[PDB]
């Protein structure tokens, strides 16, 4: 019953990646380790530290053979002029990992997070080679996710299995 | 059954006018027309001409007792975006009306134009003062639609409930 | 859901078609355009500009690979009498195109337009070669349909399904 | 169980009388017998003699206290442009009594006469002074009613109901 | 759904013929047609010329193809009986036709004649020579039946199935 | 659950008493024992003794305060012809105790004794002041019924009643 | 839906006979008549000569090719407790048939006997040779059974049954 | 679920006590312990120590304020019958207690020992002074019921009641 | 539907045999008779007599062909420890049987033994070579059970099973 | 639909706290925040540290008007034995905060931890003082919870309350 144990809910949707428009298959990334991350929408007055953080680290994942995905709600579209605004007024700047639109809510609704008012909350999961969850923290209001924590949990499963 | 003869399914959701964040509801609009007015989604390379061309001569539906309204399943916040964008690198510039943000998909759903792609048709439905649904106009693809036209059949409506 | 981007239902019904009877099937003008329109009743009071209109210029819509079918809820019987009623004493005169009976009213109904009076709405439908709708006008009341603006959503609909 | 022997089913109705449009409601006629018949559709090429047969004797009817009442599920504008046609040129001429417009099929379909095609069957029924059924002929196909042979089942209920 | 114009609701039941209770069944008249006629009770005060003068004029019936049945909800032996009493002292005399005994009640349930009393309305049904209801009369009471209409309806059946 | 222990099933039915039509409700014999018997049928060939040698005895049953209903699905108009027909001729001769019409068949269904041919089997029944089903007899064939133990059975009950 | 006229359930059932336990089956009986009788329950205060005076006659059933078999809810051991008792002591003394248990109250259930204390009534049945049940008596209180009078049933169904 | 430690499901039934018929209520023994056990079947070749063991030492349990009370399916007539057989010819002898009748098995049924063959299991119940089960022993088959085991879970239920 | 005289529901689940743990199934002891005992839980106040003197005294089981199993609703872990607590300090020190963890609660659920609380109470089972439960003690209080009691009732069960 | 940012299931059930039995009720806790967690099961060879850490710092909670909840599917006997067992020999020592006895599951199935195995997964919640669950972490693995990084999400939750 419970998410955490299980296989992760597979997806297929529109994602932006390099400036350009492409689809993501979660179990196209089986091999690898991916932290899937929901935030609630796009162009808020919330600074996006928590999206800027893993793109200004994304080496770090890389090089341990982790794949970053973050997740709205909000089209293809307004991941691309999100993308394309500069972090000076509002924006992202480039981004080294894809965005997901999740415009029909099946993704948010899968992991648990779609609330009533038709967004995710603040939520990640670690899912490991094989597509099991390993792994899920769940906010209900903004305030830090600590990338050194979200990395020291990985090398902790990373360590387990192998 | 059918829509358009009926009296228009009510909303009560969130908007941009003037550059700021308001809930709107179309109830609240009864004794002037309503052009309500559905497209599929904010900040893509199709050039919003059936937004802006409103927008341009809004004046002439003020002076003819009647609002515009545009919808999408877009956010509020995308919406102010959109609008905060110069029309040369691909905006709206100041908008004349309310652009309302069917962000649960619950607007674009009662009024039919909902797809299974989660956003809606290009479609426009005219609201009389008594909240009835007298027309609906409803596309697939992208085509200019005629202000001129809309605005033509809204004073047909008009002329015929004053007769 | 929404009927417009849907493949058109299909329909099998009598029509006069020059002041014969025949066996209509919308899904044998596949390879064509198909404005398809509905009308409430024949041999009412008001002008039926509506039909004659699409009567006199069949040639336009001809040149540009489009058939066009009206449909009411009337008999054939009385699309006959009635096409052959003069435009003079409140008929139609000699009519281009085939004129639809849809008697058990499964047409109306299917296209979202059959009213709880048994009658149905003004509406319009374009029907692109493959069979999918691509155009939707729908009216409560009787004004213009301006066929020169069907001709234009109709040749946007042609142009966008090129390139 | 049976129509026959039962409380006729109340109907509400556009007809044409002298050439205009009114409400019947057959419970208005209590007081009064009512031989109320259905016809399956207006202009068709079959002659009209079950509709002109009783216009021509109405007065044998009205002076035994009944009214006639003939029904198909044409319009109300189908019903006047009929009766305004000559019988020469497949008209009924002036018509004596009420035809019912069924437009919606609900009469036929409380009559048991609604068949599979939207129209109904040929019937002829008797309707006694209290509303209640005495009498039922149904057929299935096209041959001279009797107006002799309704006459004296007409008479036989009235002389059967004065004892 | 109405029973004039489908396939006759076939039967299986015991009956009366010169004298002597047989087995009859409906389908075996395919090739002839059938005067089916159904009347309530057997030994009432009600004098019985409804069943005696198709009696008394049969060989006009069986000259031109048709088999005549007589239905009630009695009994054969009650049938028997009757048959065997003078006309004189209420019954039949000698019955040139088979007199068909409903006991279970379904031949009138299947007619649409069976009233909540447990008998039959008087009924009288034209069936052809496929076996499908081409005529139905039906009376609430005993107002007298016209051979002689019987016999013109049934030959203008014939006449209208042989052209 | 077993009918004989339990209340007798009221009925309100049509009788015929001394040659003539009357209704008939078991209840009203409460305060007197019942001797309720089922046969088949009236008019058959089986000599119908189990009705007669009640009648010739009845007034042993009236003098110890017990009714004698006979049931049969038959008509009250088949009953009387059969008491009207003299004891030679088939018939029953003058009834000195009502037979009961049970036409709807629920008599029959009620008391446990209707088979699938739509009679009632032979059948007998005594039921007590209060109402009370005391004792049944049931039989698949005419094997003759003594009205002696048909006595002897009633006067035990009436015995162990008043001790 | 009668018992009487119906195929006996059958039973498998451990019975009394001879002083010592056996299974009967009421369908090994088939090529014999069956008298089978139901009373309440064994060692009342009630005289038992409903089951002694069979036994006391049993030879004449014996030799008119019948069994009989006498039911109660009581147990095997219980049974043969009872036949083991002197009739001076409220006993039974040597029965000449065997004695069924009904332990389950499957086979009083099964022939309607069953009552909501979970004993049955005082019952007979008459088996004919191919098990169908052809007579029934069924009794709410204690009194005299007449052997006499159930043999001449038993002939009676024999007699009928030898034509 | 358990039995054990819910409330005993309360009864009332027939039993024997000093050779008369009584009606016994579970809760009228409310203030006392209740030692409630179930056998199959009076009358068997199993001698009944579990029964005569408990009559020899009744004072024992009476002592230490505690009711006994057997039970069988069987009636209370076999009850009496066995209690007035001597030990010496199969029997119990004077009894100390009162033996159930559960006729219906109703008792056996909701102690949920009840087998498919219509006999209870051997089976025993403590019951405390306030109604609740606190103790259950059942046994498939035959062999001792330690009254001195009984006793001992007895008094030890008991002793932890008060401390 | 009784638990005794049933086949044994069959259960897979965790041990600890010899201060080790391993799966094991019921059913694989077949051939042996298996003393089957529930207790609430590890680690209470109540003196653990009921498990220890089986231990103490398992020789004499092992030497008449049976095997002791003790359950509870705690884990595998939580018996290891209680195991290797000294009896002084509140535990059991070496067990000569295995000690099985109900951590699901279906063990118990299938045994009628689970309460409200989520613990069994205190209950045994034997069960035969065969699988199938002849014997259910079960108690809601603590009370030391006599070993020399169980052993008694599984020597009888051994000698019936010979017999 | 999610319970995070929904009011937390309230529970009744026995506890040890100061090695003495008691009933405990979550809603009783109201005007405090409460850390929730369940670990699988007591006694198990696993070194309990995600237990014992928040004993030996709970001081650092009270100061911050925060009480600690531990919970799994063991009775209150078993706990107490476990709290009675010395670090050395594989138990808990002296325990600062209750230990829940969840016998029955209802608890750990009403937060979405319960396995098919009959034990809770790893996982934390923290509850805001009027019952409102504000965040969920749970764990498929026995790795490291961080109490500096419990304690941080925990100050930044208290912060962004007033």
């Given at each position: 019953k419970p998410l955490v144990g299980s296989v992760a809910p597979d997806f297929k949707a529109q994602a932006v990646f390099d400036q350009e428009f492409q689809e993501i298959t979660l179990s196209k990334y089986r091999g690898k380790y991916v932290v899937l991350f929901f935030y609630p929408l796009d162009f808020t007055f919330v600074c996006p530290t928590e999206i800027t953080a893993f793109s200004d680290r994304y080496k770090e994942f890389k090089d341990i053979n982790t794949e970053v995905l973050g997740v709205s709600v909000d089209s293809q579209f307004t991941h691309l002029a999100w993308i394309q605004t500069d972090r000076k007024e509002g924006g992202l700047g480039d981004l080294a990992y894809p965005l997901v639109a999740d415009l029909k809510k099946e993704i948010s609704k899968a992991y648990g997070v779609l609330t009533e008012?038709?967004?995710?909350?603040?939520?990640?999961?670690?899912?490991?080679?094989?597509?099991?969850?390993?792994?899920?923290?769940?906010?209900?209001?903004?305030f830090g996710?600590?990338?050194?924590?979200?990395?020291?949990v990985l090398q902790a499963i990373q360590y387990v299995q192998s």
């Open positions: 008012d038709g967004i995710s909350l603040r939520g990640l999961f670690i899912i490991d080679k094989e597509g099991v969850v390993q792994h899920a923290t769940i906010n209900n209001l903004a996710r600590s990338v050194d924590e979200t990395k020291r």
